[PDB]
Amino acid sequence: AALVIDNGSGMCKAGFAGDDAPRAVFPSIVGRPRHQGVMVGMGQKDSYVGDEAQSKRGILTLKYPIEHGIVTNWDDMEKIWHHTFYNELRVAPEEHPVLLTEAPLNPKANREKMTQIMFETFNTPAMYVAIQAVLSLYASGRTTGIVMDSGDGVTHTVPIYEGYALPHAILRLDLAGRDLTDYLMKILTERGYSFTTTAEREIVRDIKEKLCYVALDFEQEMATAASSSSLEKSYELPDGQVITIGNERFRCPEALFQPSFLGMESCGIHETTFNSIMKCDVDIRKDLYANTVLSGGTTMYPGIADRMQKEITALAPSTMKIKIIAPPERKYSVWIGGSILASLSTFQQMWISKQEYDESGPSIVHRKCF
Amino acid sequence: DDPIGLFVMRPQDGEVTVGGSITFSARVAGKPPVVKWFKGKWVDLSSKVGQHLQLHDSYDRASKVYLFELHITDAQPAFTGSYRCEVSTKDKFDCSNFNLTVHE
């Protein structure tokens, strides 16, 4: 077998290669008690790690080890990795090569340091760093197409033609679900609800994941929000506070579509996908539109595929049909790709050997792989 | 006749003097209906809730009819005039006009 770990923003996905679903899914967060605790008999547990933190979220000040695809603190990451290897997985790092999945156009330092820690901190005979766009494509099972990969951290687009890649054509977008969460918390304050702490910051994100959805037309729902009946729902916090939201829930996911509310010049997700297509060769463009694949955590909300289809069809030529494939559990597709990627016979030869690292050096990662 | 609206019982005109409390109510046959109270075409009573005006909403289990109440306590002469009740819902529309008189 083999070990596959996804070190994405906010969540750490771990599991075994060859398995359709990972063994360990839990937030990558460390929570500590900001305020002195009052009670008798408490163990006073100074540090909380994993899903335990989620239950005791209000008192704890949550900290994310990974910001914008960059890890702020290395020791916290080790605790996370330790937790995945010896808790839910119940396996030793020594036992198998470890596969890590990285987003496109990611900085050089992240690959070199990540490999260095895996070779030094957790001793393993070999390791490989994968690219999220190609792995998602394998889950799709399609040889040719354009892949828009939006993670919890940074949205990336990577077109592919029959296995050949176009690095110029790949476009990185700075709009993501986490950004939406910050916009969302900012929008709540005008209404009269204010969240200024990281621990309750997750609470708005939780609201966004199931309560929020994407409107067929933004202006019409706002117009009909005056007489809202089914537009408002009550969310119950573990704390016991009650939250009622209306037109507010659908205008949040809208921002990816309409960056103007955010205040940034950069175009929305449908325009960016279009831009990536323009970068690509004209001959391969025609099946790019009909082979569009959606992936990542922020593509979960219903109606995204339908809104994207009409918008791409209107902007693009009408001479060909536009097809978008958006399968469920696309959020976990990146991890899944890692497990499938390590399952190919050709791939095992490709892993970065310890010997090669020792001779050539850390800088060989870019040389060996994309 | 006219189509059946939200109110089983329409609000009724009432008169009360200074420092006197008066209650006006409407009931709706039955999610829960939304009730707005107005002091004319464009004036909302909810924004005017204070010392002389209170709002209360209740439900009667046996007739599964919603009761909307306008509470006026310690009514004053300046409150003499015309008040309009407007209720809007998912499937029905109706409103009514009533007058309140309070003296010095």
Curated annotation (Swiss-Prot), chain A:
- Carrying N6-methyllysine, the residues are K79
Subunit structure comment from the entry: Polymerization of globular actin (G-actin) leads to a structural filament (F-actin) in the form of a two-stranded helix. Each actin can bind to 4 others. Interacts with TWF1, CAPZB, cofilin and profilin.
Where in the cell is the protein located? Cytoplasm, Cytoskeleton
Gene3D superfamilies in UniProt: 3.30.420.40, Actin, Chain A, domain 4 (3.90.640.10)
**Which keywords fit this entry according to its UniProt record?**
Acetylation, ATP-binding, Cytoplasm, Cytoskeleton, Deafness, Disease variant, Hydrolase, Intellectual disability, Isopeptide bond, Methylation, Non-syndromic deafness, Nucleotide-binding, Oxidation
The name of this protein is Actin, cytoplasmic 2
Query: Where are the Methionine (R)-sulfoxide modifications?
Result: M39, M42
Q: What else is known?
A: In vertebrates 3 main groups of actin isoforms, alpha, beta and gamma have been identified. The alpha actins are found in muscle tissues and are a major constituent of the contractile apparatus. The beta and gamma actins coexist in most cell types as components of the cytoskeleton and as mediators of internal cell motility.
Q: Name one GO cellular component term.
A: blood microparticle
* Cross-link (Microbial infection) Isoglutamyl lysine isopeptide (Glu-Lys) (interchain with K-50) placement: E265
User: What clinical condition is it connected to?
Assistant: Deafness, autosomal dominant, 20: A form of non-syndromic sensorineural hearing loss. Sensorineural deafness results from damage to the neural receptors of the inner ear, the nerve pathways to the brain, or the area of the brain that receives sound information.
PTM comment: Oxidation of Met-39 and Met-42 by MICALs (MICAL1, MICAL2 or MICAL3) to form methionine sulfoxide promotes actin filament depolymerization. MICAL1 and MICAL2 produce the (R)-S-oxide form. The (R)-S-oxide form is reverted by MSRB1 and MSRB2, which promote actin repolymerization. Monomethylation at Lys-79 (K84me1) regulates actin-myosin interaction and actomyosin-dependent processes. Demethylation by ALKBH4 is required for maintaining actomyosin dynamics supporting normal cleavage furrow ingression during cytokinesis and cell migration.
Q: Which InterPro entries match?
A: Actin, Actin/actin-like_CS, Actin_CS, ATPase_NBD
Curated annotation (Swiss-Prot), chain B:
Kindly provide the PTM information from the record: Substrate for phosphorylation by PKA and PKC. Reversible phosphorylation appears to modulate contraction. Polyubiquitinated.
Q: Which domain of life is it from?
A: Eukaryota
Q: Which residues bind Zn(2+)?
A: Q54, H56, E69, H71
Q: Where is the Ig-like C2-type domain?
A: 3-102
Q: What is the protein's known function? A: Thick filament-associated protein located in the crossbridge region of vertebrate striated muscle a bands. In vitro it binds MHC, F-actin and native thin filaments, and modifies the activity of actin-activated myosin ATPase. It may modulate muscle contraction or may play a more structural role.
- Family recorded in the similarity comment: Belongs to the immunoglobulin superfamily. MyBP family.
Q: Which disease is it linked to?
A: Cardiomyopathy, familial hypertrophic, 4: A hereditary heart disorder characterized by ventricular hypertrophy, which is usually asymmetric and often involves the interventricular septum. The symptoms include dyspnea, syncope, collapse, palpitations, and chest pain. They can be readily provoked by exercise. The disorder has inter- and intrafamilial variability ranging from benign to malignant forms with high risk of cardiac failure and sudden cardiac death.
- Official protein name in the record: Myosin-binding protein C, cardiac-type
